[PDB]
Design a protein around this ligand. Sequence first.
Ligand code: CL
Ligand code: CL
Ligand code: CL
Ligand code: CL
Ligand code: CL
Ligand code: CL
Ligand code: CL
Ligand code: CL
Ligand code: CL
Ligand code: CL
Ligand code: CL
Ligand code: CL
Ligand code: NA
Lengths: 116, 116, 116
Amino acid sequence: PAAMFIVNTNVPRASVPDGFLSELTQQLAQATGKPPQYIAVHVVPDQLMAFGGSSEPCALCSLHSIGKIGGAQNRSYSKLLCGLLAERLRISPDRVYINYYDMNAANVGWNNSTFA
Amino acid sequence: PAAMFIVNTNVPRASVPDGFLSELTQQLAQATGKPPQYIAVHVVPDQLMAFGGSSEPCALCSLHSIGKIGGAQNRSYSKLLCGLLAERLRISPDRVYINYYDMNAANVGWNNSTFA
Amino acid sequence: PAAMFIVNTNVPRASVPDGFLSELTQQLAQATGKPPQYIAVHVVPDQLMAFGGSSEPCALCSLHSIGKIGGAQNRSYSKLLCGLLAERLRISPDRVYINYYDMNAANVGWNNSTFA
Ligand SMILES: [Cl-]
Ligand SMILES: [Cl-]
Ligand SMILES: [Cl-]
Ligand SMILES: [Cl-]
Ligand SMILES: [Cl-]
Ligand SMILES: [Cl-]
Ligand SMILES: [Cl-]
Ligand SMILES: [Cl-]
Ligand SMILES: [Cl-]
Ligand SMILES: [Cl-]
Ligand SMILES: [Cl-]
Ligand SMILES: [Cl-]
Ligand code: NA
């Protein structure tokens, strides 16, 4: 029942709060209904990026999850995640993409095996 | 209207020309037929990479797009993008992979919703 | 004949042993049955990451492969790859996710074209 979230951004490392990974973990756990133990998070600052040809702060993100992905859920996650990026990283929400992936258990390895 | 392109390479940051992000944005807008406002680009130099076991210059790239992906289109994008990587970054085309992804609109979040 | 493996980890660059990229290339060629020429590897240390809310050593990885992906194969790759991350990088296997992707040939660009 793994899930993982990655944020790639041009904002500098010093502007990513030290608690941001834990905030994301906790908020995603609540949003997906998964124990936080199952959630992994990866933040990549200082990237060379443009969004719409401009290099104001932006983010390209991905959420890969075994289940809990779908049209309505994804609309809800986008509000959650845009809110977090807007407040903590000062990124305008119209400069964020989030790609959503519903992963089959057989296609997620963990602990020397897969979830299937 | 969304598309996003990432290039990961071992070539050094100093060898990425000024204007490269803008060139990628404009060339991708033209190639995909999408307005530049919704094209995002991400260039990641100085990576620890090998291609065929060799650490000569190489790249691993991804193009995620809502539509505009398919057999003939992807061949055209590959000629365009390998050409740019060869000309601008001096990477041989046979040391480049580009993964193409046709994203469902429901699976791309942007500005507090999805594109669905 | 293409496959590509990325490992993102918080472990420091200096802890990645000399030859790790070569070992990954060789072992992935053996495991997938593909010529080593077409195996690409990408190792990304020093990342800002958490797994289950802990920032102890962890990894998020992906294997994209034209074929050679499936239930039994992915279990085998996970045992191989988690074993390598444990032995070489000292990452507990229960702090690793590996996402597996079976790529269509038409969706992998290489050498100014695609594999389709
Ligand atoms: Cl804040
Ligand atoms: Cl899947
Ligand atoms: Cl535009
Ligand atoms: Cl086509
Ligand atoms: Cl080569
Ligand atoms: Cl999709
Ligand atoms: Cl094969
Ligand atoms: Cl850490
Ligand atoms: Cl192990
Ligand atoms: Cl753990
Ligand atoms: Cl595919
Ligand atoms: Cl040729
Ligand atoms: Na290699």
